[PDB]
Amino acid sequence: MDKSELVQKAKLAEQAERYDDMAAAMKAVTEQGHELSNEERNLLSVAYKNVVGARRSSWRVISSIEQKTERNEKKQQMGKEYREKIEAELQDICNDVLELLDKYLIPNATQPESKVFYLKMKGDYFRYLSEVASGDNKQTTVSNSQQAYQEAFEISKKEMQPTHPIRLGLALNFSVFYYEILNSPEKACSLAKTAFDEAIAELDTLNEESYKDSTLIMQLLRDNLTLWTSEN
């Protein structure tokens, strides 16, 4: 199968909502060692976000059921083991994408825009690992998520305008990392507010291609800030 066939397969699988097939096809593209187009970047990201996102959603449902269940071993055992099964799937999926990013995508990125895109992804999948990790493993995933986000953040601040959707989307997810993983609401709020303020200060730089994503992300920044500051 040549790359052109794998990409067409990924597109068909997306249309059919067969995200395992979609992710398998884009993993195969990536493992052939050549750099991705913008479209192929989005196919890879959409595929793996749907695959991991199903487990993240399932995990929250099961964890919520455990918390409403009588607190004894016979009533809790199945939910605990089932949650752990979902966690191991999530870890396998995240380890999969993180290997692709570290071995192929990041070292070979040809422009700061794609490099930031991939480092943001690396921070994301280490964040999803951190959502369910524990012990020494969690300290490692939290550290690696922070490092990838911060490196992407430094590059974006040197190379991208504050209205750039990748820079805004990075700042949004980095702020979520601070709030949800590091339990540091002050830095999270300060990062989210600054990202919004810097984009609206340079609103005249927002172009047609970016308008939809950048204004959506700006709204999510405000949505998060109201949610986060409602903990008074």
Partner: peptide, 13 residues
Amino acid sequence: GVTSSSCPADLTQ
């Protein structure tokens, strides 16, 4: 349970 919102998976580049 409401959670924080994060970035969409597909971004214009």
